[PDB]
């Protein structure tokens, strides 16, 4: 398997031919990232290092949690925003904190300073870097048969769902905000430490005062089938419900959904939700998202 992360960066260096950097002097850009725990930056030597008539451009890994495999491509953008004079690494190079990789002779100053080529409109040099971080992934697959017999897929959840949906052979009543729902002690106790406790300490009538009927139906559906079809529309409430009734997998399935919606506009609201219902995974994601957009 394989996982590739692509991200790029634009760096405009104003009044380029005006910067005093001499042979050997290097100017670095601001740091950028692809959340990702890596911080990168670009390095350019207006007058090379060893050589003098070329620009030296390098990708530099500034920070990382103790190695990275990455391919990169450098180019210059013209007035229309198109790429020109591109140069890319043939393969991915190994990076560690403080290490860089690039091209000693990226482009001749002579070519760059020739207005005929228009790579310095308004004496501004816009460099463009494309990065591809690669990680190895292990493929996962099921065992395959060797017989001509086709075995239907398991249908345990679906059949059990028919029990809740069509209220068959129920033995208890769940009263949610005045509304009554038929259920089965056994199944609720098998899947909810909380219900298990109740039916442990007539006992067929349980009052539910912390969840809305619409959210409760979805939660109950997860209890009988292990699925929540409408999680997309109430992941925040379902999280709360899942937390109150100790349905961990549903909890995380929501942490997952709430995480995929994070934006600079709701990250704060969501962090509050994560804190109150102790949604560890959602908490970290939110915090980092908040910092990354600080």
């Amino acid at each position: 398997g394989s996982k590739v992360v692509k991200f790029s960066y634009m760096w405009t260096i104003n009044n380029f031919s005006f910067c005093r950097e001499e042979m050997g002097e290097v100017i670095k850009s601001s740091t950028f990232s692809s959340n990702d725990k890596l911080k990168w930056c670009l390095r350019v030597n207006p007058k090379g290092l060893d050589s003098k008539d070329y620009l030296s451009l390098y990708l530099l890994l500034v920070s990382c949690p103790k190695e990275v495999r990455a391919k990169f491509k450098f180019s210059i953008l013209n007035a229309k925003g198109e790429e020109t004079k591109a140069m890319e690494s043939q393969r991915a190079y190994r990076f560690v904190q403080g290490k860089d990789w690039g091209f000693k002779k990226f482009i001749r100053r002579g070519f760059l300073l020739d207005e005929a080529n228009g790579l310095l409109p308004d004496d501004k040099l816009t460099l463009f870097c494309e990065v591809s971080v690669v990680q190895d992934s292990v493929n996962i697959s099921g065992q395959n048969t060797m017989n001509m017999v086709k075995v239907p897929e398991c249908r345990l959840a679906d059949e059990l769902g028919g029990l809740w949906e069509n209220s068959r052979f129920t033995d208890c009543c769940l009263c949610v905000a005045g509304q009554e729902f038929q259920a089965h002690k056994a199944i609720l106790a098998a899947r909810s430490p909380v219900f298990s406790a109740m039916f442990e300490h007539k006992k067929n009538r349980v009052e539910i005062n912390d969840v809305e009927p619409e959210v409760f139906k979805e939660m109950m559906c997860f209890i009988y089938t292990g699925k929540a079809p409408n999680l997309d529309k109430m992941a925040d409430d379902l999280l709360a419900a899942a937390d109150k009734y100790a349905l961990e997998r549903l909890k995380v399935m929501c942490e997952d959904a709430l995480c995929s919606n994070l934006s600079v506009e709701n990250a704060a609201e969501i962090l509050i939700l994560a804190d109150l219902h102790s949604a560890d995974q959602l908490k970290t994601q939110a915090v980092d998202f908040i910092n990354y957009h600080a």
């Binding site: 690494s89 190079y93 860089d100 690039g102 000693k104």
Partner: peptide, 6 residues
């Protein structure tokens, strides 16, 4: 040609 300054 890809190189590292170090």
């Amino acid at each position: 040609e890809v190189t590292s300054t170090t």
